[model samples]
Target: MNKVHVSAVGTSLLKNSLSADNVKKEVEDLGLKDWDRLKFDDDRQNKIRDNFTTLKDLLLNFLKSKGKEASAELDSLLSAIEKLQHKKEELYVFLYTTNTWNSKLAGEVIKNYLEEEGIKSELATVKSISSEETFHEGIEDLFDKVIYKILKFKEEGKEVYINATAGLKPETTFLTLAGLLAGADLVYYKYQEFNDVVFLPSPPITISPRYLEWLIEFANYGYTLSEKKAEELGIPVRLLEVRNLVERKGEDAYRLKDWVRKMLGIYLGSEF
Candidate 1:
């Protein structure tokens, strides 16, 4: 399968914020109102350039440590401070972000860097759908968009990866979950330390055909069906295994769990 990387946009911003915080006094001395927006002076530009160069190097070294042997061309490019110009296997990157200028800016920077290294990349943006009557409805909406992108890529036989490095904590959480549930090949987060790209373990978790049979029966009957009825209908219900998705009642009857139905509603949406 062809591999693709999906990363949350905000790591660079996080790095810039931490770097600026550490050099607050120097920023003030430079008569700079915002160190993050610094670009006028050669010294300030060089500092910003150096920081990002180090970030690229860290990413390269991290990949190398993972046994992705570095190409001689790439090593020379990094040594010459032309990290972006390094050539390697074509990488496909999906940069995810909320619809904000800052989010887009960080994504663009990363996209350009990858492009310079002969990688294909694009931005996947989700809108903030906030309304008084539908608070957190936005989360479902956003996830729907993200899930579509992931599943679409998967259908194309691409090995998808989710990068949970930066973003709102809740957003990152859902992104990782979506990737895992959708069967992404890998999910990870990068840290400041060169050797610290935390790869998340994703084992397969899937609903059984028997569970689906029970669900369909329950939906059609409009009530909890007894174990006797389950057998009469040739449906096999594993009561113990379904404790999370179904509520056992009267010792032999089961109904869909409220949370399970809600989650299924969100997942299937109009398709349901």
Candidate 2:
């Protein structure tokens, strides 16, 4: 299948390109800080902070974790989970509550959703100050940076590893925009054109709240199951099959805007 490559307008460099000061300015331009005071309950706040800390610890543990066999298994699972969660595991997670809605229309809708839900009194209306000169390269750079950090630990004396897991994350929004782009490329390259495809409105593929939770779980499971020890420690076969089905038929049924909006709405609730 000929590949369907996505060329993003802006890359992750936007995350780094803007200095802390500039990002603060951008947030102000979009009124992002207005939501800062919208605090969560102590319990909810701790839970969220704890999740972040746990993930951070994973990074530290990658280098310090003991046991080659166990470490490798754990790393394998992380890689599999990354792939399952749209391949760009790290950025993918951040994009859910942040970058995914970084666009103009998305930003506005999100603000309204939050206000309605009583989550925030105000929201950011971020606007792009400038376009990226090399978005594709930016994505690749991010992938390389993330890959380098993970593998660097191995060279520093860590035994857990997964070869080429760096390629697990997509270089752009192509995966999130259209999950079937992978399979679409498969059909195209192996055949030379998108000829057998029938674009008919079968159903509205709503990515509900449950689907979002499942996405994280699905990705984690895949990352965990991946290893040389195959049958002895198999990946979740059922989840993979379900993922294949959803991407092929369900997600492919909706356009990127609709798919993103529906899912974001589910996550943001009234805020969406």
Candidate 3:
């Protein structure tokens, strides 16, 4: 069986003290019509993961390249990067054309890219979030779950990788950060050189502190590492993978953001 490897990282906050329920409550108490706002945020996160699964497949296929006559890690990296570029095209098209991504579209995007490659599938949306404290509690819960799953695979002598590419709720982002710690823990357990651990395909997703701020007062807890700091930590990815949208369209990042915002407004009823 192939050896398992999973890598992830995300945005950080100052202090975490809210929960999903708290967010729901806050919105409810205010009697805002943006009741779906919380869910919408979660849905957007799902979009990122829908694309990630495809990228994961590309990476797994790349493992075979390692022992080949001309194989190098860089080759695998470049190949996966190419796949990500393609995936971005699909995302851009969907976000632009539909103006909003529904669950149906989200599922299709994931299966179209990842499932065809033989990755076993499971999707989860954990609810019951009530406060920032509760969010962290839920996050720890997922981390333990992934770790337990990985360990279970180990005992069965099966190589296993637990990856997150969708629905990165606040807890999901926390798990991604903690997963960085897990990678290192794995290395320490196996006596692998810590420095040899390399994250691939560029910046990991970021669940901006802004999201947390939106959820609760003073929810910003500890400082998470910045992109530059991530490079120092040996993460091999960059985030906001913009190839198909910007590169293909020959637009710069600023222009592309405005362009996408425009599409969102026209199609999804977004004001921005």
Candidate 4:
């Protein structure tokens, strides 16, 4: 079977290109104060997006180099493709990206880079969902198509790989499980915490059917589960806390951990 590689591309290549010297020259050139570091929190992300006119040239030069500053998505995809060279069919790539300007731009840059490396690929987009409370309707609507497409590939008997190595926190978390629940053959990411690319190849992971169902409803309703709420739902709050499935959000309230919440919104469309 041919392999399908779907990557959630982020702005890492741009961020990596901002080496100490890269920023020193740009910040000094523009006489900017907060340009000393390229952080992608909402504020810094906006700063970078707004100033693309100033920094894009340098960024392009670095990306053109494609040596030490390639995107994490690129790194993982290359490794994955290399690992799969023994397969019979040529690799097919889908650069799944967010509608945000920066991510979309990164998608194109990475796609161009991939072509130069002689890879065949396509880029697709969904809205940028964020904690800032924008695009609520998109979350409910756009995601079904995304999940459905991946499911289709699986039904085609393709070897599906989810490269969840990029994009924003909200977006990436959702991307990770969209592949997991859709029955991906593998899910991999360049994990920043340990500075390694962790690959989960359809690991035999399972949970209590009730825990699975409960977490979905918790995220669906969008509320912090307090002791009272947990009790009200007959939840085993202690087991959840011990397993770190939920994170403390207040003195007595907690929310489903990002990974757990991400597992949900999977069967959001027709499967349910």
Best by the TM-score measure: 4
User: Model 3 over residues 1-272: C-alpha lDDT tens digits?
Assistant: 33443322111100010123443343244343232233434545354345454423432333233221122212222233343342322211110001122232233333333344443333322323457755544543444445334434455564333233223345435444444323312211111233132332323333244422321221121222344533554432233223311112222211222322222222223232
Per-residue lDDT over 164-193 for candidate 1, one digit per residue giving the tens place of the 0 to 100 score: 665667777877776666667766655545
Give lDDT per model, in order. 0.54, 0.28, 0.31, 0.65
Per-candidate TM-score against the hidden true structure: 0.54, 0.17, 0.29, 0.59
Specify the highest-lDDT model's number. Answer: 4
Better by TM-score, candidate 4 or 1: 4
- Alpha-carbon runs more than 4 Å astray in model 1: 14-89, 129-135, 208-270
lDDT of 4 by residue, 57-90 (tens): 5655677765623678877787666665624246
Poorest lDDT segment (10 consecutive residues) of candidate 1 = 68-77
Clashing pairs in 4: none
All candidates: CA RMSD in angstroms? 10.5, 23.1, 22.1, 7.0
The better-scoring model by TM-score among 1 and 2 is: 1
lDDT score, candidate 2, position 150: 26
Q: Give the range where candidate 2 is weakest over 10 consecutive residues by summed lDDT.
A: 182-191
Off by over 4 Å in 2: 1-3, 7-14, 33-272
